[PDB]
Design a protein around this ligand. Structure first.
Ligand SMILES: c1cc(-c2ccc3c(c2)OCO3)n[nH]1
Ligand SMILES: c1cc(-c2ccc3c(c2)OCO3)n[nH]1
Ligand SMILES: [Cl-]
Ligand SMILES: [Cl-]
Length: 163
């Protein structure tokens, strides 16, 4: 575990992370995808061997010895708000199981279902709160990666508010 487990947020490509493993915002079919998923495909293509996994689950595949945790958030275009909320919470619980199993001291994580699976809604708070619900009981240092300047500020505020 980390000596003083923390949350941090950085505004940069998660493919450039400085953590011991990465979470991919994966699609269920293990396809290269878009956004975070395509960045992860470019950096760790070997990790897409048999990475297909259902919505609400995570499946880890090693790129060398570097673990890629493929976490499949729901696409809110297809799910009801209620069912999507349940699957988004479930994906993050499976990420916490994998991070724990791997024994890493740090993990790079995107906000699941906030991009093209958002169904056109701002889900920063919904996705971040499910991240915290899952990761709070882990002792890994968590580094959240985002692209938007305003999201960075809002994620940073939410982290600092609970310290
Ligand atoms: C294509 C674009 C990017 C990207 C991701 C996050 C960023 C960023 C660029 O500039 C500010 O924060 N990664 N692949
Ligand atoms: C649309 C979204 C992105 C993207 C790629 C990598 C990222 C990211 C966003 O947020 C952190 O790591 N590229 N084009
Ligand atoms: Cl997404
Ligand atoms: Cl973002």
């Amino acid at each position: 575990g980390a000596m003083a487990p923390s949350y941090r947020v950085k505004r940069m490509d998660i493919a450039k992370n400085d953590e011991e493993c990465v979470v991919n915002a994966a699609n269920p079919r293990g396809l290269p995808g878009d956004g975070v998923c395509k960045a992860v495909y470019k950096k760790w293509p070997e990790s897409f061997k048999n990475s297909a996994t259902p919505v609400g689950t995570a499946k880890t595949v090693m790129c060398g010895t570097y673990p890629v945790i493929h976490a499949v958030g729901p696409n809110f275009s297809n799910y009801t708000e209620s069912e999507g909320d349940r699957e988004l919470a479930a994906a993050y619980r499976e990420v916490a199981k994998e991070v724990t199993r791997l024994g890493v001291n740090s993990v790079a994580i995107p906000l699941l279902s906030t991009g093209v699976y958002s169904g056109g809604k701002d889900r920063l708070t919904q996705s971040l709160n499910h991240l915290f619900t899952a990761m709070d009981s882990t002792d890994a240092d968590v580094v959240i990666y985002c692209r938007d300047k305003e999201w960075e500020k809002k994620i940073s505020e939410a982290i600092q508010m609970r310290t």
